[PDB]
Design a protein around this ligand. Sequence first.
Ligand SMILES: Cn1c(N2CCOCC2)nc2c1c(=O)n(Cc1ccc(Cl)c(Cl)c1)c(=O)n2C
Ligand SMILES: Cn1c(N2CCOCC2)nc2c1c(=O)n(Cc1ccc(Cl)c(Cl)c1)c(=O)n2C
Ligand SMILES: Cn1c(N2CCOCC2)nc2c1c(=O)n(Cc1ccc(Cl)c(Cl)c1)c(=O)n2C
Ligand SMILES: [Cl-]
Ligand SMILES: [Cl-]
Ligand SMILES: [Cl-]
Ligand SMILES: [Cl-]
Lengths: 235, 463, 463, 463
Amino acid sequence: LHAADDMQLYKYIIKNTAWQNGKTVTFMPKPLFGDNGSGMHCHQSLWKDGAPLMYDETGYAGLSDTARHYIGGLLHHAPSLLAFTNPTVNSYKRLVPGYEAPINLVYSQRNRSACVRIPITGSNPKAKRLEFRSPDSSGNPYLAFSAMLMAGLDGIKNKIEPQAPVDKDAASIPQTPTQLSDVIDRLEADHEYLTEGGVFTNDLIETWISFKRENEIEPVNIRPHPYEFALYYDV
Amino acid sequence: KTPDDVFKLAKDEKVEYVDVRFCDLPGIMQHFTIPASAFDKSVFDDGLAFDGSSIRGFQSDMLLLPDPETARIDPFRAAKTLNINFFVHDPFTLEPYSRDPRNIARKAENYLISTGIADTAYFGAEAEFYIFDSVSFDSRANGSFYEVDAISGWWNTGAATEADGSPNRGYKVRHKGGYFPVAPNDQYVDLRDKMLTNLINSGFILEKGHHEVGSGGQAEINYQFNSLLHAADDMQLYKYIIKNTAWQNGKTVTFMPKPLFGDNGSGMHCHQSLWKDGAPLMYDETGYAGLSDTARHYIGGLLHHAPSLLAFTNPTVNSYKRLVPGYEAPINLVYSQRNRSACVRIPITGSNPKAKRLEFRSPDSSGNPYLAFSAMLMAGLDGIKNKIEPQAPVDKDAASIPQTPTQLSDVIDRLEADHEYLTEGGVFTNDLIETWISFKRENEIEPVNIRPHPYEFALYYDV
Amino acid sequence: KTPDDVFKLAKDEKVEYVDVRFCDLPGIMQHFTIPASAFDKSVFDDGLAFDGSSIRGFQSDMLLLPDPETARIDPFRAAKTLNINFFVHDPFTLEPYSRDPRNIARKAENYLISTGIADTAYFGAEAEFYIFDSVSFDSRANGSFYEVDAISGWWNTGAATEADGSPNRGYKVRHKGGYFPVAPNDQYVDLRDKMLTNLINSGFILEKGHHEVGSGGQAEINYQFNSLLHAADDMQLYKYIIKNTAWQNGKTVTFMPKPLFGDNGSGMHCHQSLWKDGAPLMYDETGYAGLSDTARHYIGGLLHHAPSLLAFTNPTVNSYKRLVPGYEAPINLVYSQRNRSACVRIPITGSNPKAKRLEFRSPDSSGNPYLAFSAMLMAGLDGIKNKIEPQAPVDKDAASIPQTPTQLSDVIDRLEADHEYLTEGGVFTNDLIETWISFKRENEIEPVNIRPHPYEFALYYDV
Amino acid sequence: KTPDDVFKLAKDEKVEYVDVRFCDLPGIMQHFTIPASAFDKSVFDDGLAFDGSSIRGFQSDMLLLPDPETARIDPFRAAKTLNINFFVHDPFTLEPYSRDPRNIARKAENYLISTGIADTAYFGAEAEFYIFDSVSFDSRANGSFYEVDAISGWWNTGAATEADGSPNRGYKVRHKGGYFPVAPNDQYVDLRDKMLTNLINSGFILEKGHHEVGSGGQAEINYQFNSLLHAADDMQLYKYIIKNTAWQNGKTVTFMPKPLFGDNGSGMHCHQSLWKDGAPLMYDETGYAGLSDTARHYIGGLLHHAPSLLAFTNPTVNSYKRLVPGYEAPINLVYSQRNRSACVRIPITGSNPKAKRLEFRSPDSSGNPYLAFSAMLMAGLDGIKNKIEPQAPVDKDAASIPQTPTQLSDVIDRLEADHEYLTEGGVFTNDLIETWISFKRENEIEPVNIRPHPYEFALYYDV
Ligand SMILES: Cn1c(N2CCOCC2)nc2c1c(=O)n(Cc1ccc(Cl)c(Cl)c1)c(=O)n2C
Ligand SMILES: Cn1c(N2CCOCC2)nc2c1c(=O)n(Cc1ccc(Cl)c(Cl)c1)c(=O)n2C
Ligand SMILES: Cn1c(N2CCOCC2)nc2c1c(=O)n(Cc1ccc(Cl)c(Cl)c1)c(=O)n2C
Ligand SMILES: [Cl-]
Ligand SMILES: [Cl-]
Ligand SMILES: [Cl-]
Ligand SMILES: [Cl-]
């Protein structure tokens, strides 16, 4: 909760420092074509009774059973999870099918192209964690962090096993969907994990799906893109 | 029309040049020019040699053979010129080149004959366009824009003076209740008439049921149908004449499906029928809407293959701004007689068997009529061969009725998954289909996809 | 054509002035004018005297003798004028001046005869050019620029209004799939036709295989080949007609190899063949690609001497912006039948022996066709005399294949190291070759070299 | 200087932030910032972790270790900041990363020791720069420009008013006979003094023989030499202080070799000497110009390896606009005592053994001093190990004397062919040299090569 509060305050302070100094800031995922997008890397760990739960010397990359299953949840639910972690049409201009894009549904230790990265922290158990790389700053950190935790928890409860990790840089590796409308469809089809313990309600999820369809997806869709004039004016 | 007819036309009209025209893959006509004195019998017999990376459009020698039916005097070129369309052949083998759209249309017609189902496929097209005064656009790292404009555009009622500094005289607003008001609301009468005149002078046949229509800056002139290949030739010539009549009169035309947001898109309604031994095949008093078994099965093919068929009939990203999920949009995969919202409509023609036909309403003018008409025929023919039964027709205006896909990328995926019907008889080749899929993915779908949309800034700049 | 033919043309056309033309070293035609009334037999017999620092281009008296085959009515000059090309002779000795490019082309033709190898060398050239609306540039102590522009240039899609304040009407963008679209995409149709018409009226022969082509602002009109000297005369006249047709219609043309960055360069494909006693020498059914021993050895010479040959066929710094190490560039020192990437291509002409020839693809229009065609013949002749065997031909599209050098300074070095083949029969003299090497080094290579390039500021200002 | 010294400086100066600096390959310093409160002993012992695609410059985790000798208060940053340079290490192995220029300089120093030839290599550099008021440039399809400007530039004597509309007050023209006139001809006195003051405040030592000099917009401030690595650190800090002193006073500085055509280029004269056990190794009364065997052999190495050495000392395309084949240019591969035109000069220092050294005059400021100094040492050390004998020195002012290559592409070729001396002791690795060769070819040489130069339009538009 307070991490999300911190994010809101971060954005507030960044935007207003700029504003007071005659500038203007955007957190939108992709304001510049042919230049770096803006992402939000999310580090996550679970703790119990003041002790870390993610570490195990014996597991791959120092990961416990609980950690691996959490990852299992993230990767399995990713297509729907992006409805909160990457909630805008503009998000999918960053998450693009042919680059360094964190769109590959695998976990890794070296591959700066996987959804989930395990930062190298050595043998210090406290530092062990997972970094979800896909998200951006375009939505709601309260909802995004919550949704991530719910995916992880569903992964633990159902002992979901993730695909084998990939440490080297074809059609074998699954992708995150490439459009908001697709991820909204996936959210509609698979939101059971979010309703566990009444954290998200069906009512809220349906509202979110409606809002994005009617206010965001469709209004962009019906409006001719300037580049369509370059392509097609003279057909 | 024969070679001798063409030479006679050349001599009578005192032609100075001959323009050698051939169609490229996306649907733009290409040309080079030769002196009339070099246009003789050896052009029809041996053909014209031309560099084959130039004929192919990518970076070997090709041979061009003229189609005498397509010969027309160019009404725009100062030097008296005869335009003729050609087919692309391999120089060694004389084989029709498999990626020349005109060959594909010819192959489609020959295939029809070879199945014994019919001997002629007739296509009639009604194509809309917009007349503008100006267009500009660009796409940069830090920004993007487009702007189309017209003196009489309804968005200009507030202008203090026109672009040339002359006064605003009004008569711009579109009213409820009537789409086709008389002058001065109609501000394009004389220009449209010039287009009409040029079409009639260029051999277009306008008779009963053919008209010139205008609504704001939008217009349409329809004309007599033709057999498949020559119907597509007619469409190319139509576009050529409309664009250049506008150009010569200080205007600029677009056939793009959706140039204006919140205004009518531009469609191409395609009428189709099959004929054998001078007799129609679509009629039967006893069938629904007067349709024979052959007609119903053709419809079956159209509706079944529609998701992939749109890759040719609606081949651009901009197409899907017209085919939009919540309007009057011809996106519903049903056939009907009253519903101006179904893919296939059966125009009401009474009991005259000759007039019976089907109108495919989804297409637009943004692609290649040679490929689009061919693709439509192939869908229909696969429908007949496999006796495909269409869903029950719908004559009344929920989740029950299937839709056409809503994005070019989706219809390209569907083409990839289901193009078997197009390869029958070698009309389309797997090679060509794969090329078409690549081209649309790399040059159209992806380049639009990676570029932020202006409205994304309205929605998201301040997230 | 005889002197009497020329006098008859002068009298029939009511010529008022005769333009005395001669070629300078780099390749620009020079002139002065005399009244027609002073153009008589004594011009052909004795010649015209003219100050010989003026004829030579540097700072003695020279004599000019007319070539009757080059006589043409000037279609641009208001006062009726006859243009004729001349040879430069020493007044005392009547010796052909060794630095007049026209003499060098004549010497090349006579040398051919004297070797007994053949009696006629035919050259066919296809030369591209760009049509622009404007050009400006300068080079100062603290800055430098150039800018070429055209209303219809693809970089101008975003212009609010045109340079004259008229509205932007679009149709500027180059599409994938087709290089030669019809109007209105083709925005130079009428102007190109005017160029074509002027060429035909000026005695150029356009028959089977000859065409007018346009792509954006780029164009080409090819025409019937000719014997070496007169083929080069034809090229000079071609450029003259293209440039001035443009000029009279408010445009400006350039034949420079590479005016546009990231767009097609302008090349000059050079077709060549040798003939003896009215019969072709290049054909043999049994040889690869129908090539005789004489043809293959000619190719051997072209490829062996290519690095030095480019000093005349690609004689400018700007040439090497077209001949660039990573493209479709005709820079690969091989011959081929399919590979549009080899220096020498053998056009496919079937079994007709007369049509067999070789196409040297590397050259551009930036220099001197008299010197370029001569230099090409000498390379081919040295190849025959020494029976030089070319590498195995390549019909498929690594470090194995040798390249043409990539800079003018390199090819000038190679010319300095290997010009023996040019001095055979005294066609080129050592004196001339040394002068050419000096000129290019001091006036072209070095002046470009010492001037910072604008992109160096992008790369390095902040180092 | 020790870690404790640095902490003491941080505390005394009330530093708010620490700037973590590391050098990229081409030679620009990179940084990120941490709060001062996180700058403690664990920074020196364990280092700082940072994303290793960010540290590497291409698209794994890297560790950064501070060099206490490089700590300096930033005089420009409003928040009180301490700048420190770092070495890049692999996190797992603690191995110095082989492509961090700072490590390379360190490896060079350690290698020297390990050969027993000497224990310390001293480098002194004199680097010139230009002060301008403005710069702009671009590179587009249809045109290209750059423009640098200064109110007092000699090309501006004719200006009716200055850029701000204030009157032209003259005193701009450069006169014959004196390069360093006093004010008001000298229009940068106060700005240069600010630069001088900032250097002194930043730990630069200026004593006997050190000065501030200005000529038009050009300037130089030299300062006490240092051991190799730290001399390169000093150079980076020098450039930093010059550029930002200018920036804070509304000006803009460039260290590019040749910003002005027909005005002095900007060079970096590099003084070098070897020392062992606190004693000089370069002196010998008996040798020519007071040079020991070790010195002469070092020179031998420099002159022998110069063609490849310039890949680091003169690493840009713009470098070769200064090193031009017909001037005072330090391009002659000889050593001398009087000839201000030789690569290596021996400054006259009399019989004081400590002062004896060699000045390499060819280099400029356009690259990476860490790599340049290292490469120079390696050439010298290869010269000593193989007792390379240099050509006879030249004290008088033809084709006898060898030149440095005249183009970056040539020196890159020479580096590719001869880089064995750089890999001795693993100072440079083959991997790094290949990367450097690729980088220069793909990002610098080729991009300049493919872009038409403005002067080509002057020369060739009308061919
Ligand atoms: C009226 N119409 C249109 N137009 C409808 C109005 O817009 C122009 C096309 N297209 C038609 C028809 C049309 O009537 N038919 C049927 C058809 C076919 C061949 C013959 Cl000989 C005859 Cl007499 C009739 C057709 O087969 N097609 C394709
Ligand atoms: C078609 N062509 C072209 N053109 C190719 C198309 O562009 C213009 C030049 N150049 C040719 C040829 C060409 O055919 N020949 C061979 C040649 C030579 C002499 C005679 Cl009498 C005859 Cl009938 C044929 C040649 O020797 N040359 C040089
Ligand atoms: C005067 N100078 C310059 N400057 C010349 C004027 O511009 C600044 C560099 N650079 C020098 C020298 C220079 O004197 N030396 C020799 C040297 C080396 C070490 C010691 Cl302890 C001493 Cl006392 C002298 C050197 O080794 N280098 C590198
Ligand atoms: Cl979407
Ligand atoms: Cl799409
Ligand atoms: Cl050069
Ligand atoms: Cl270079």
